[PDB]
Every structure is written in C-alpha cells, then in structure tokens.
Structure 1
C-alpha cells in the first residue's frame, strides 16, 4: 500500500519483482498522484 516495499537485495525473482512493482506503483501513486 502506501508503505515502503521490501527490497530482496540486488536481484529479486521476477514474480516477487512483480509484487514489488505492485507495492511500488501503489506507493508512488500515493506519494505522487500522477499517472506514469
């Protein structure tokens, strides 16, 4: 949600990287309400 996403080091597996994408796009959509 509007929280910092867990960083699985330097190389995350693409599934969890997609999960990271979810949390990241959500976080950014919150802190910066603009479409990217």
Structure 2
C-alpha cells in the first residue's frame, strides 16, 4: 500500500515540500501506474 504523504504546509521549509514531492511521486507511481 502507498504511504499517505504528510503535508506540513506551503509555508513549511522547501525540504519538507521536496520530501512530500518524493512521497507523492511514489504515491502516484503506485496509484496512477500508467494512468491519467
């Protein structure tokens, strides 16, 4: 199962945003596997 990406906010440090990016990228790699 894909992990739920934790979102601290948009005011959060960009490294946290990057971490979310990677987690969401993996999340979509799982969910939207060759879809959308």
The bucket for the TM-score relative to the shorter chain is 0.7 to 0.9
Question: Paired residues, what number?
Answer: 36
- Cα RMSD, aligned residues only: 2.4
**Which runs of 5 or more residues in structure 2 are unaligned?**
none
> TM-score under structure 1 normalisation?
0.73
For structure 1, the residue ranges without an aligned partner over 5 or more in a row are none
TM-score by length of 2: 0.73
**Which runs of at least 4 in structure 1 moved beyond 4 Å after TM superposition?**
none
Larger radius of gyration: 2
Where relative contact order (Cα < 8 A, 6+ residues apart) is larger, the structure is 1
